[PDB]
Structures are given as C-alpha cells and as structure tokens.
Design a protein around this ligand. Sequence first.
Ligand SMILES: *[C@@H]1O[C@H](CO)[C@@H](O[C@@H]2O[C@H](CO)[C@@H](O[C@@H]3O[C@H](CO[C@H]4O[C@H](CO)[C@@H](O)[C@H](O)[C@@H]4O)[C@@H](O)[C@H](O[C@H]4O[C@H](CO)[C@@H](O)[C@H](O)[C@@H]4O)[C@@H]3O)[C@H](O)[C@H]2NC(C)=O)[C@H](O)[C@H]1NC(C)=O
Ligand SMILES: *[C@@H]1O[C@H](CO)[C@@H](O[C@@H]2O[C@H](CO)[C@@H](O)[C@H](O)[C@H]2NC(C)=O)[C@H](O)[C@H]1NC(C)=O
Ligand SMILES: *[C@@H]1O[C@H](CO)[C@@H](O)[C@H](O)[C@H]1NC(C)=O
Ligand SMILES: *[C@@H]1O[C@H](CO)[C@@H](O)[C@H](O)[C@H]1NC(C)=O
Ligand SMILES: *[C@@H]1O[C@H](CO)[C@@H](O)[C@H](O)[C@H]1NC(C)=O
Lengths: 101, 422, 51
Amino acid sequence: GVAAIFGPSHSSSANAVQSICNALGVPHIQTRWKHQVSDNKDSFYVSLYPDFSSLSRAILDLVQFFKWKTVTVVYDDSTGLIRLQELIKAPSRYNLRLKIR
Amino acid sequence: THVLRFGGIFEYVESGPMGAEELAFRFAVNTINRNRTLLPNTTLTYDTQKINLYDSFEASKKACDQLSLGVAAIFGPSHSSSANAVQSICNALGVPHIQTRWKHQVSDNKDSFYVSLYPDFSSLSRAILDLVQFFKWKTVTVVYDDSTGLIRLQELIKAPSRYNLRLKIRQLPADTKDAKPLLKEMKRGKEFHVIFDCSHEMAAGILKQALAMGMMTEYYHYIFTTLDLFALDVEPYRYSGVNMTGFRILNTENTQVSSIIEKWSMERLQAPPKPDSGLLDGFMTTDAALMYDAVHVVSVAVQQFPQMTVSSLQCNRHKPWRFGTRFMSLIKEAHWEGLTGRITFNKTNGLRTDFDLDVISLKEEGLEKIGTWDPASGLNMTESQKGKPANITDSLSNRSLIVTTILEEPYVLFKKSDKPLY
Amino acid sequence: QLPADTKDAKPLLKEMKRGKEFHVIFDCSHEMAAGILKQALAMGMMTEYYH
Ligand SMILES: *[C@@H]1O[C@H](CO)[C@@H](O[C@@H]2O[C@H](CO)[C@@H](O[C@@H]3O[C@H](CO[C@H]4O[C@H](CO)[C@@H](O)[C@H](O)[C@@H]4O)[C@@H](O)[C@H](O[C@H]4O[C@H](CO)[C@@H](O)[C@H](O)[C@@H]4O)[C@@H]3O)[C@H](O)[C@H]2NC(C)=O)[C@H](O)[C@H]1NC(C)=O
Ligand SMILES: *[C@@H]1O[C@H](CO)[C@@H](O[C@@H]2O[C@H](CO)[C@@H](O)[C@H](O)[C@H]2NC(C)=O)[C@H](O)[C@H]1NC(C)=O
Ligand SMILES: *[C@@H]1O[C@H](CO)[C@@H](O)[C@H](O)[C@H]1NC(C)=O
Ligand SMILES: *[C@@H]1O[C@H](CO)[C@@H](O)[C@H](O)[C@H]1NC(C)=O
Ligand SMILES: *[C@@H]1O[C@H](CO)[C@@H](O)[C@H](O)[C@H]1NC(C)=O
C-alpha cells in the first residue's frame, strides 16, 4: 500500500515500473532523464529532470553565442545521441560543422 | 519427447485479420508439423496471446501466463518498451527469448538468454557507409523518423571523423507523412544524396511527396535503410532516371525460398489491400520472413536435443528452468539456410552480425540486383555493365618530355650554391 | 510530333531529355494536355527547369 513510486533511475528499469503505475493508477515520480517513446500512452508520471529537448537549446544558444564553427560533440553511451538530437540537427540550419566521436 | 509448446506475444489488430508476424509464426509451426523430415517424432504446438505493444505491464502478465502452463521459448513482443520487459522475465526464469526486431541493447544489460534474428545495425551501418564511398559522395542528408533512428545509424554519424562526408542530419515531421516543408528545405540546400531511415510504409509515403515536389529526377540518389524495397511499388518512379539503392536480405532468387512466398500469398489470399498507399502485394516482408526463420532455428536446437520435458514455472516464485543453460547454447550455435540467407549469431551476444545482403537498385527494367555485400569481404559489386559506351574520353596527358642533354660550358652547366640543389 | 493517336509519348519525351529541350510549346487539345503531362511526370521532366 503506497501513494507514489520514486523512480528506479534507469531506462530499462524505469519503463517497466512506469507501466505498472499506469495500470494501477499510483503516480510514478521520476528524477532522471529517460528515452520517452513517442507513443507510450502514459500520463501518470512526472519527470523532475531538466529535459534535453529543452536543455540542448541551451547548449545550442551557447555554441552560437561563442560563434563556434568547429564543434566536436563527444558522448559516452548510445543514448547520448537522443539527448543531443536538437544540437545534431543544427548544421541543417546554421553554419556549424559537427564531428561526432 | 512430446508436445513441446512454444509461446508467442503478438499485436492487437482489434477486429481485423491477424498480424503479419502472427501468421508467420502460425505458418511456420504448421509447416514443420506436416514435414516429417525436420523434427520427425515431435509435434510443435503454439500459444499466442495479444498485447497493446506499448504496455510493459500487459507484456509482463502475458509472459508469465505462458510461463505458467509451460513454454520452451518466447518469440518476442517486438517493441523496445515491452521487449526489454519480457527479456528480463526470460532471464530470471531460464526460458529463451527469440527476438525478430531491433531494440536498443542497453550497454550494461548483463542478459544471457536472448537471440535477435534481425540484422544488427553495427553491420548494416557499415554497409550504407560503403555505399556512400563506392558512390563517392561528399554531401549526405541522413533522414530519420523517430529519435531511436540515431542509434541505428551511429556508425554512419561517426563517419566525418574518418572521411570527408559532410552529414546534414534531418528529421521527418512527427508522424504525419506530409513532409513537404522538409523537402522544400532540401531543394534549397541542394541536397541530392538522401539516406532515408524510414520503414517501408513511410518510404512509400515520402516518395509521393518527393514526386509532387520536383525531386524525383536523375539528380537525386536515395539510399534506403529498409530491407523491404522489393515489396515497394516503383511503377511511377521507374522512368524518372532516379537512383534508389538499398538492401534486401530475403533470397527471392533461390527456388526453395521463393516458393514459400507464393505459398504465403496463397494461405493469406486476401492481404488487406490499400491501392493508394504505394505498396505492392504482401510478398512476405522482412518482419514476417524472420519469424518464419525464428521457428526453424529453434527447431534445429530441439532436433539436436531430445530431452526437453517442458515444466510449469512460476513467475512470483521464480526458479531457473532445468534445461535452460544447455538448450540456449544450441540455439546460439545453430545454423540454418533460411529465407533470409544463412543464420548465424554472434557468440558473444546473440545478434546477427554475419549475414549476406543483396544491394538491389532501380533501373528502367524494374528494381534489380547490382551487387552483394558480405561482412568479411565487403562490397562485391557486379557493376561490370554495358548499356552505353564509356562516359567521356580516357586520359592522354603530360608525359613530362624527357630531354637528352649533356653538360657543357655556357650552354648547360651546373649551379654552385650554399644550400643543397636538387 | 506526338505519336499518331496514342498518348504513350515516352519515346518522344526521351528524345527531349537528351536534346536538352526545356521550353516546349505543346499544341494539343485539353484531353491530350492532361495526358502528355502524366508522361512528362513519369519521365523526370516536371521540375523547375522546364517551361
Ligand atoms: C560481433 O562479433 C564481431 C566479430 O565476430 C566483433 O567484431 C566487430 O565488428 C567488426 C569486425 O572486425 C569491427 O569493425 C571493423 O573495424 C575495421 C577497423 O576498425 C578499427 O578501428 C579502431 C580505431 O579506428 C580500432 O581500435 C579497432 O580495433 C577497429 O578494429 C574496419 O575497417 C571495418 O570495416 C570493414 O568491415 C565491415 C564489416 O563490419 C564492412 O562494412 C567492410 O568490409 C569494411 O571495409 C569494420 O569497421 C569492429 O571493430 C569489431 N568490434 C567491435 C567492438 O565492434 C564484434 O565485437 C561483435 N559485436 C558486438 C560485441 O556487439
Ligand atoms: C542510376 O540511374 C541511372 C539513370 O539515371 C542508371 O543508368 C542507366 O541504366 C539503365 C539500365 O537499364 C540504362 O538506361 C543505361 O545504362 C543508363 N542510362 C544512362 C542515361 O546512363 C544507373 O544504372 C543507376 N545506377 C544505380 C546504381 O542504380
Ligand atoms: C521438408 O524439408 C526439407 C528441408 O528440411 C525440404 O526439402 C522440403 O521442404 C521438405 N521435404 C520434402 C521431401 O517434402
Ligand atoms: C522416433 O521416436 C523415437 C523415440 O522412440 C526416436 O528414438 C527416434 O529418433 C525418432 N525418429 C527419428 C527419425 O528421429
Ligand atoms: C565476387 O563475385 C564473383 C561472382 O562470381 C565471384 O567470382 C568472386 O569470387 C567474388 N569475390 C571477389 C572478391 O571478387
């Protein structure tokens, strides 16, 4: 008997607990970014982490304030491309020259 | 042994025909039961259940329902949110979990009991990257549809750090295939060499927007990352002069492999048509070709192991299955000349990273094979064509005109200097 | 000249691509101007280079 679930903090472990909280009704408060699938029809959760859909505007505002033309974006795990996808689509509109490593 | 029940977790079409992957799982069991050559004294029985494909609580309940009455494999829920939930149930219980669809393997997964019959994109992304170097490109415009499509092509995005490609990564609109404000930007950017990463439903849909825009001509090349170009209607696009290169793994040239495809259109016999979509007859696409292989590769491993008496395992009181560790290796070192080429798994993972592709392209006579990719060799193109004599001219050039010239005073004499003269 | 009555004018329009002929002055009826332009779309000839 609980009134919340506080966010097991993974991408594979959080998605499994989220759909349990959706079917049972209890809220699922997350504190870490997660690859939220475009059609997971769940709204019984809140995600208290600054979303990389908006935080990667801020890196994009910062790399055009310093006027960089030769950025060299370096991630560590393959879910880092989802985090910075608003920055990787930026040479299609600005004059950045990315080089992802 | 005896009955040897399998398990299946499939989609929820909701008052129509059953899915493409579900008939392919039910056509494969009915074929092996009647052919007494493969699996002689067994009789395979299937158990299929229905989930929403997006609910990892229904996929976890309908897995532990099948694990309760006894299965010997779980043939995949085929979606990233719910495949990872059934994978870890199959890990804690022992029973294998045969997958026919690419999901993101999380790096610290530590899961032993799964194999994936979909060709892994560590090898496919090194096969687009050799078609952007055989065709000698410098400007590519990789287009995907959802945010997972960056992970599928991550060995294509890490390419300008080794070569001279200049990627211009774009994204289709959210789900609507009215991608004209995308394609208006691709005309003004002079982007001729697009590398679409759609499905075969959207590669039939974006190309009707690329024909309404003035973009299906001889100036545009299109590499597709779908293994279903052969089931694509290309009758409007054949005379344009376009180039539509891609891949297919399904052996539509072999006799025993092609004959099952017309048996597939015979047993289906309705294949619910949509003549304004841009797709051909069903043709047993790669999503359903692999499920026909997934039953046979396991059927090899039960042929080589006649000790399986499938027992009733719980889900809340989980106990590892008795023959779980022994039987999982027989799936993983199995080999089968199936529909999709040879089937061998990467013995570290359980991922197909060794597989034969064909490099089919669009010509004026249809959509024809031009080569063959092979991960050991590379592009073995069968380029070697005659349809028109060679492009402009060959090279006659400098030749440097060597001159026989002796040294002699003030005609030809050496120079004296301080620094060396060469 | 278009082929006799059949609107399958693709061997005409193949010659008009190789001749670099961008500025065509069709003298059809409105039944054939609806018919040749579906052959000029199946050929790669309905773009911004053609008037
Ligand atoms: C599945 O099992 C396979 C083998 O059984 C494991 O091997 C991986 O896959 C290939 C096969 O060797 C490797 O990729 C190849 O690397 C060559 C050079 O890359 C080197 O570069 C770095 C530094 O730049 C080195 O440090 C490193 O050691 C690499 O070896 C490329 O030239 C190859 O390209 C050619 O082969 C591909 C086939 O994939 C074809 O498209 C063409 O013929 C192309 O010319 C290729 O890129 C890869 O490095 C191997 N290792 C890893 C870790 O991926 C896999 O490990 C295993 N899969 C897993 C564990 O997921
Ligand atoms: C790319 O497209 C070109 C046409 O734009 C193809 O070249 C033609 O191939 C057909 C084969 O039947 C013939 O008409 C000629 O050999 C070619 N025509 C011209 C004008 O060159 C080419 O084969 C395509 N290449 C690939 C890899 O798809
Ligand atoms: C049974 O399968 C074999 C290959 O395993 C194949 O030749 C055919 O489909 C079947 N054999 C006969 C004699 O029908
Ligand atoms: C038929 O079943 C028996 C079990 O009594 C088994 O030993 C035999 O191998 C089976 N036949 C074939 C051809 O496998
Ligand atoms: C490529 O395919 C041809 C076709 O028969 C074959 O002879 C050849 O051995 C293959 N490999 C290479 C490296 O050319």
